[PDB]
Amino acid sequence: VLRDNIQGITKPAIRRLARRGGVKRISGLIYEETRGVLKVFLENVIRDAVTYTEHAKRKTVTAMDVVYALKRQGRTLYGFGG
Amino acid sequence: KVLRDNIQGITKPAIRRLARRGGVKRISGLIYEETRGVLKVFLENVIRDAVTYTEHAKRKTVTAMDVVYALKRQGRTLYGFGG
Amino acid sequence: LAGNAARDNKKTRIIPRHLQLAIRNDEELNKLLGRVTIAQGGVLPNIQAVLLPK
Amino acid sequence: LAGNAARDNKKTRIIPRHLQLAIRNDEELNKLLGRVTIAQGGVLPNIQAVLLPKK
Amino acid sequence: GGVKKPHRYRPGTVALREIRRYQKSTELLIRKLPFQRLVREIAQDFKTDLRFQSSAVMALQEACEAYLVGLFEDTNLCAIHAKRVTIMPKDIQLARRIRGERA
Amino acid sequence: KKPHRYRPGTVALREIRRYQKSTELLIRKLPFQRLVREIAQDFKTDLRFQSSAVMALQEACEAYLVGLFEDTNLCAIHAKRVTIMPKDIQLARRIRGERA
Amino acid sequence: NSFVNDIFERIAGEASRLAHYNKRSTITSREIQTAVRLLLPGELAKHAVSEGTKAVTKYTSAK
Amino acid sequence: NSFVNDIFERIAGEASRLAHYNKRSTITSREIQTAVRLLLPGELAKHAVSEGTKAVTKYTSAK
DNA sequence: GCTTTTTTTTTTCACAATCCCGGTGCCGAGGCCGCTCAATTGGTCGTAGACAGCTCTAGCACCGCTTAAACGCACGTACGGATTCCGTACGTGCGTTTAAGCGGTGCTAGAGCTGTCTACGACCAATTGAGCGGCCTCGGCACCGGGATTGTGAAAAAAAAAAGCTGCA
DNA sequence: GCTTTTTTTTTTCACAATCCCGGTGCCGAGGCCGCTCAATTGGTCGTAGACAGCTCTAGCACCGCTTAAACGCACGTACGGAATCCGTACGTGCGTTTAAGCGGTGCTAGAGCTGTCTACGACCAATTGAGCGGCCTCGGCACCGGGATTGTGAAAAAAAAAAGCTGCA
Ligand SMILES: [Ca+2]
Ligand SMILES: [Ca+2]
Ligand SMILES: [Ca+2]
Ligand SMILES: [Ca+2]
Ligand SMILES: [Ca+2]
Ligand SMILES: [Ca+2]
Ligand SMILES: [Ca+2]
Ligand SMILES: [Ca+2]
Ligand SMILES: [Ca+2]
Ligand SMILES: [Ca+2]
Ligand SMILES: [Ca+2]
Ligand SMILES: [Ca+2]
Ligand SMILES: [Ca+2]
Ligand SMILES: [Ca+2]
Ligand SMILES: [Ca+2]
Ligand SMILES: [Ca+2]
Ligand SMILES: [Ca+2]
Ligand SMILES: [Ca+2]
Ligand SMILES: [Cl-]
Ligand SMILES: [Cl-]
Ligand SMILES: [K+]
Ligand SMILES: [K+]
Ligand SMILES: [K+]
Known about the structure:
This is part of a larger assembly, with two copies of chain A, two copies of chain C, two copies of chain E and two copies of chain G.
Chain A: H1 11-20, E1 25-26, H2 30-56, E2 60-61, H3 63-72, E3 76-78
Chain C: H1 2-8, H2 16-24, H3 27-32, E1 36-38
Chain G: H1 2-21, H2 29-39, H3 42-61
Helix pairs in contact in G: 1-2, 2-3
One chloride ion (CL) binds next to helix 4 of chain F.
Chain E binds a DNA duplex through residues 1-3, 5-15, 17, 31-34, 51-54, 83-86.
GO cellular component, one term (chain F): protein-containing complex
GO molecular function (chain F): cadherin binding; DNA binding; protein heterodimerization activity; structural constituent of chromatin
Family (chain F): Belongs to the histone H3 family.
């Protein structure tokens, strides 16, 4: 079961996120659409993170690899060694 | 030394032309005045930074490069006037 | 501002949420950090009018 | 890609429009210059389907 | 009606023609002098007795028209998204809000 | 004859208020972690992750989606709906310059 | 800590560019000040300029 | 000319960071390459890396 | 107008969510202590840039003519938006199932630090050719006028799908 | 099937707009020239970082309990969206008015370059105290239970606007 861990992003988790963004009523077609978007997000961020890892010659991805990736993507993050 | 609300020189037809290039087919009357406000804010922001670059360089003349540096700052990079 | 948000929650110590409340409720700090994510901050309580019961 | 856009428009010399058509019609160049304005470039011919005459 | 003989085009036909015209061309669509006065006028609010390179005014106009032409594209989508063909101030306002230009 | 039932939308609003009030992560940690490692596979094999790299990624993702939902919501309301649909998300991401 | 580093990098980066654009080898208190006007919103910039000006003045008097 | 200067600044700047993040005083061809991978889209990066590698190889052999 | 019904209205009751008491226990904020370093001090030396002084680029103002564009109104169609209405996609709540989260243990990859040594890059002085500005030319390309072609819109003429009618199986 | 109609076709004609050509003329792309300054050559000197070698961090695997969260299913309400319908806001086209655009001239602020000179910042060695890691402590804060209270909405019961109907004249 699950070569697609993307399904482990449950309908409920997606509803919760949507709640915190003030969404009240949610089309059935959203949960699969959201997974589509979340993947592209992580694809782009992890790609750059892993490039920072390879360049440092490491086999371990660090919080700083992610922080540097997110900043490059215009999604600056505070609290993980900025 | 004239001011005299030159924003009205941004005519209805000129705004209609810009909307046409943007693919817009039908335009509410309220747009024209709403656009003029938007255009003003845009220029205030770009020109405020251009002029900052001018004052820092100790000049009395705004250069293309002041604008090009101003636009780049405002995440609106412009090609074909230097830099 | 964060220390004020902390006292309003009857808390001695600032946590990321007090920093988030401080920043998002200040028009200018919000602009300065308009493209920054504060880890463990959540969002300002806000519900669109059309969604409310009346 | 600009040279080709000039050739299509029966022109010898590349102008800003040829660069714009070149860049905006290429998925990848378009992404690389997604936040760049090309002076005297204009926009790609694009009329949303809903706006055309129905029949 | 009938042989009025202007051959009055239906509302939206000339509009479409103007769209094809202006999407074909790259020439600036605001009149140069009016725009140049407006630039000088707004610049007075920041500093007095300022001079402008002619290329500095042309760079501001290229920048402006590109920004408005692009905001109109996004505005048009917001109008269509609400099953309208007519752009309205709330369209522009939604575009600018989503763009993060406005709170 | 039947004790209490809430009308559609009432619990929704109840959840909105609860989650807008909290800051804890709203995706379960392990499922998220596997997805991260699964996606990493495609770029380089036998990769290790600091726990704070995975926690950084989840914070950034959750923040991104909450924010996208805010924009999606407004698009729904703009078309005079209360129900967010894919085209709402699509329009938000189009105007945000994330998507062609 | 992130916040300080973030704004440090922004001001220092703009300052770097100010100097570069004007063919200067030195970042002075004047490049920092311009950087700040450009980077901070209205009120914040005024107070920030005010505090920076006050700190330099105090320092130069106390050298 | 604007295009060349743009991508010069982007690549160089990313390289500046890569060397800084890894406590390196020196920008090498490895920093440029990693910058290119981060900055250019899929197919463009591949060609670019290919043409960059070729040119270094051909330079080093030509001394 | 009558009876009959749906729609909206209020009233009355149920149920979370919060706030005020009571308390406990865990773990990380906080602060102290050696003591690693980087900040400070006082010195030299070199050059960045402040300033004055001069050149001359290009930015500003002005005028008057032509004509393209802006303006304002007349007119009507197609658009926006309100209202109505129907089907079911979603939200709610329940019982059942699943695996996350926790706290612990056991193993070791690989992060990360030190010490050594030399390949490589900064710096310099001398050399010189690539790329600069300045200048001249001549062919692309902007603009024009004329004719060919393409698309639009209105009415009329045909083709089709729809409506009320009517008998026989 | 039959007429007998509306709805959708198609066809035919006038007309405006756009497209495509060759002709013409202007000016900037293009290339040549001569001088210059930045790239190259060959030289020294120092240290950045490649590498080996060792430490021990923290990342991974695994295990076994306890739920909280996920799952799926029934059930129905309120929402999305189709259809209808009406008023006028907006697009089109025309005549009238305006001022941009053009090409040209005249005047000089000030952009930008040069030469001079010294205040200021880089660099360095000696000194030493701020701030680092490590370590221990003790109170904040997460969590808990027991009530009272007030938000947040859901029925239920009546009131009202709406919709049926009908027999009259
Ligand atoms: Ca403030
Ligand atoms: Ca207590
Ligand atoms: Ca605990
Ligand atoms: Ca304490
Ligand atoms: Ca000691
Ligand atoms: Ca020591
Ligand atoms: Ca000193
Ligand atoms: Ca003329
Ligand atoms: Ca190793
Ligand atoms: Ca070392
Ligand atoms: Ca030559
Ligand atoms: Ca040349
Ligand atoms: Ca030629
Ligand atoms: Ca050498
Ligand atoms: Ca001067
Ligand atoms: Ca101390
Ligand atoms: Ca400490
Ligand atoms: Ca409780
Ligand atoms: Cl509006
Ligand atoms: Cl959709
Ligand atoms: K000048
Ligand atoms: K480790
Ligand atoms: K000086």
